[PDB]
Motif scaffolding. Sequence first.
Motif, PDB file in Angstrom:
ATOM      1  N   UNK A  62      33.282  61.045 -12.330  1.00  0.00           N
ATOM      2  CA  UNK A  62      34.696  60.856 -12.641  1.00  0.00           C
ATOM      3  C   UNK A  62      35.529  61.751 -11.729  1.00  0.00           C
ATOM      4  N   UNK A  63      36.290  61.138 -10.822  1.00  0.00           N
ATOM      5  CA  UNK A  63      37.064  61.893  -9.842  1.00  0.00           C
ATOM      6  C   UNK A  63      38.543  61.543  -9.935  1.00  0.00           C
ATOM      7  N   UNK A  64      39.013  61.215 -11.138  1.00  0.00           N
ATOM      8  CA  UNK A  64      40.401  60.866 -11.332  1.00  0.00           C
ATOM      9  C   UNK A  64      41.013  61.646 -12.479  1.00  0.00           C
ATOM     10  N   UNK A  65      42.345  61.647 -12.504  1.00  0.00           N
ATOM     11  CA  UNK A  65      43.089  62.281 -13.584  1.00  0.00           C
ATOM     12  C   UNK A  65      43.236  61.383 -14.803  1.00  0.00           C
ATOM     13  N   UNK A  66      42.809  60.126 -14.712  1.00  0.00           N
ATOM     14  CA  UNK A  66      42.863  59.188 -15.821  1.00  0.00           C
ATOM     15  C   UNK A  66      41.491  58.553 -15.999  1.00  0.00           C
ATOM     16  N   UNK A  67      41.256  58.022 -17.196  1.00  0.00           N
ATOM     17  CA  UNK A  67      39.956  57.454 -17.521  1.00  0.00           C
ATOM     18  C   UNK A  67      39.662  56.232 -16.658  1.00  0.00           C
ATOM     19  N   UNK A  68      38.380  56.037 -16.354  1.00  0.00           N
ATOM     20  CA  UNK A  68      37.952  54.866 -15.616  1.00  0.00           C
ATOM     21  C   UNK A  68      38.134  54.929 -14.118  1.00  0.00           C
ATOM     22  N   UNK A  69      38.142  56.123 -13.530  1.00  0.00           N
ATOM     23  CA  UNK A  69      38.301  56.300 -12.092  1.00  0.00           C
ATOM     24  C   UNK A  69      37.070  56.961 -11.480  1.00  0.00           C
TER      25      UNK A  69
END
Lengths: 53, 54
Positions: free
Chosen positions: B40-47
């Motif tokens: 997980x490399x995002x600030x929001x879920x599912x990235x």
Amino acid sequence: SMRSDTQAMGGKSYRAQEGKAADWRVGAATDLTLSYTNKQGEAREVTINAKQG
Amino acid sequence: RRAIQEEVSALNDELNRIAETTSFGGNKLLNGSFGSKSFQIGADSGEAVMLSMG
């Protein structure tokens, strides 16, 4: 109420019935339409035309 | 040839040892039990991004 069990402090979660591996790729069928009712009461339709590959 | 084969077998057992024992904090990597995991490399879920090692 701000108890952690309050309805407004969450949502509804839906899950896929089919598992897809790391080699799965979208084929010739890609459209995915989400039809529900917004909070104000109006029907809202969102169409997602995903990218093949 | 048997002298060469002994070194081949010794290195062959070494290849399996590397695959089984290689780990990152106790999690095996090269033994095939890693499969595919999403990072997980995002600030929001599912990235997240899938990583696979056979």
